[PDB]
Design an enzyme around this catalytic site. Structure first.
Site, mmCIF file in Angstrom:
data_model
loop_
_atom_site.group_PDB
_atom_site.id
_atom_site.type_symbol
_atom_site.label_atom_id
_atom_site.label_comp_id
_atom_site.label_asym_id
_atom_site.label_seq_id
_atom_site.Cartn_x
_atom_site.Cartn_y
_atom_site.Cartn_z
ATOM 1 C CG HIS A 1 0.713 3.189 4.304
ATOM 2 N ND1 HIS A 1 0.501 4.259 5.155
ATOM 3 C CD2 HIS A 1 -0.236 3.210 3.334
ATOM 4 C CE1 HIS A 1 -0.554 4.906 4.674
ATOM 5 N NE2 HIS A 1 -1.049 4.300 3.598
ATOM 6 C CB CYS B 1 7.902 7.152 9.401
ATOM 7 S SG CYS B 1 9.159 7.789 8.251
ATOM 8 C CG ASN C 1 -1.760 -1.239 1.367
ATOM 9 O OD1 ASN C 1 -1.772 -1.866 2.434
ATOM 10 N ND2 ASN C 1 -2.440 -1.654 0.308
HETATM 11 C C1 LIG Z 1 1.345 0.122 7.979
HETATM 12 N N1 LIG Z 1 0.155 0.851 7.580
HETATM 13 C C2 LIG Z 1 -0.395 1.868 8.282
HETATM 14 N N2 LIG Z 1 0.073 2.200 9.493
HETATM 15 C C3 LIG Z 1 -0.453 3.247 10.150
HETATM 16 C C4 LIG Z 1 -1.487 3.998 9.681
HETATM 17 C C5 LIG Z 1 -2.059 3.671 8.431
HETATM 18 C C6 LIG Z 1 -3.115 4.415 7.859
HETATM 19 C C7 LIG Z 1 -3.589 4.106 6.624
HETATM 20 C C8 LIG Z 1 -3.077 3.003 5.921
HETATM 21 C C9 LIG Z 1 -2.030 2.286 6.423
HETATM 22 C C10 LIG Z 1 -1.499 2.593 7.700
#
Ligand SMILES: CNc1nccc2ccccc12
Ligand SMILES: CNc1nccc2ccccc12
Lengths: 268, 265
Positions: free
Chosen positions: A192, A227, A190
């Site tokens: 992230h 981050c 995604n």
């Molecule tokens: C590891 N993925 C995520 N960690 C924290 C917040 C998030 C918010 C939206 C999508 C993914 C997220």
């Protein structure tokens, strides 16, 4: 891998790879953390949930809700050697309206002995506004049929290390590693930053002498803020003691906290 | 995994993991490169190496990568099984070559291929040297005697000369540093990390609208644990080609040079 006989837990075997080991020719804690997330993802797929790391249900998808990690706690007694087979069993439990918990047990496949255990706390968040919420009845019922009904805990002992409150490291830090940035290999499907990258960044401020003469036994990590791809991180550590350390990850500029944690190390 | 029937090559299957895939839910080129090194290591173990010979170990000699060349036609999807076959060949006194063929396990079709050139170096002085007869004979019994090439074509991309990128670069990513996860079991930066650092200076728009088809990377000098790297890229071109340069952030010492070829999705 496969769901167990009662369908309430999932098991998978992994052979430790040459690039997955450190200087002692045994798996790093980051390799272990990646395997924990891999078995968690295979458990979610096996029972029909989303596979993108969010383990989303039908009603969550429509409401733009996701599961996010609040805390990860891992205890390793013996790191598996390169070429060794490790078996990991995982299961989930609802914790009322607060959120969910995913637990793991790591075993040596040959001897059958428990070599490690882990637990993680997850909270529900709106993926767009980033606002947390309590778990509704509609969502609890959909998850409950895939969870054991009686409590099943990787960390059952009263007042165990997985539930301790972590304090905020005070400046000046004893040790630091600054200017840490994620590259594309640190991102998930995604885009992230993968949760395991933060474990690596925490460990970057531990001196090489500790790593060379000690083995990491316990790590507890709180996740406060994400981050972003273009953010820069500073990793801070102070000895609090076996050797124990207090850790803090914060944004390089404004000093915004992204994580806090503790590690416990045993002399080799 | 296992050595094949004639014992002159090695095959291994891998199921693609959730953390090993990119935005399109298919394996990254760094995941592919890690699997190539894993199958190479399993081939070496299966025939008794550790990939030094007995003569190399006493002389403090090691094999080091001079060039890596990878071509991917189809990246395996998350949950898919990929089969990788690998073998080695001696290239006279110059060094050795390791080749790989990647196949989709279900269809049996070739989805990728790779080749790598290795040179002999003294571990301590870092001085390169020609392969002796004693070392050559020791590894020849594990290699096919007739030529077997992953890249047989007459003027193939794996043997092209790579020029040195001239300043100013069109794109750059500055201040790249390895963390402990980037190191191998000997505390040296893993060869795959350099592939990642090269790709860091490609703009996100190219990555989002193109697929990496070919990457050729030359290894000139090692990045140490406390070194800092700058990654530089300039477009040289329906297909997009780039010229790449990795150099030390301070003195500008070259560590790698390479080229990439990308096709529109
Ligand atoms: C590891 N993925 C995520 N960690 C924290 C917040 C998030 C918010 C939206 C999508 C993914 C997220
Ligand atoms: C990835 N490992 C290495 N690459 C280059 C030069 C090296 C010299 C000594 C030991 C390891 C080396």
């Amino acid at each position: 891998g496969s769901l167990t006989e009662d369908g309430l837990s999932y098991k998978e075997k992994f052979v430790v790879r040459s690039y997955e080991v450190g200087s002692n020719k045994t798996a790093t804690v980051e390799t272990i953390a990646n395997l924990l997330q891999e078995v968690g993802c295979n458990h979610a797929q096996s029972v029909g949930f989303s596979t993108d790391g969010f383990a989303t249900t039908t009603t969550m998808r429509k409401l733009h809700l996701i599961w996010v990690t609040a805390r990860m706690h891992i205890e390793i007694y013996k790191y598996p050697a390169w070429g060794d087979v490790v078996e990991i069993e995982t299961w989930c439990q609802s914790e009322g309206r607060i959120g969910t918990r995913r637990d793991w047990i790591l075993k040596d496949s040959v001897t059958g002995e428990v070599t490690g255990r882990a637990t993680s706390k997850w909270v529900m968040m709106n993926q767009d506004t980033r606002r947390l919420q309590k778990v509704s009845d509609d969502v609890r019922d959909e998850y409950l049929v895939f969870c054991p009904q009686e409590p099943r805990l990787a960390f059952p002992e009263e007042n165990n290390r997985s539930l301790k409150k972590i304090p905020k490291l005070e400046d000046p830090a004893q040790y630091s590693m600054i200017g840490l940035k994620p590259r594309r290999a640190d991102l998930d499907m995604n885009q992230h930053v993968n949760n395991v990258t933060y474990i690596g960044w925490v460990l970057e401020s531990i001196p090489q002498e500790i790593v060379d003469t000690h083995e990491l036994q316990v790590i507890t990590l709180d996740y406060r803020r994400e981050c972003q791809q273009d953010d820069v991180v500073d990793s801070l550590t102070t000895t609090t003691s076996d050797s124990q350390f207090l850790h803090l990850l914060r944004l390089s500029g404004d000093g915004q906290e992204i994580n806090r944690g503790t590690t416990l190390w045993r002399k080799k």
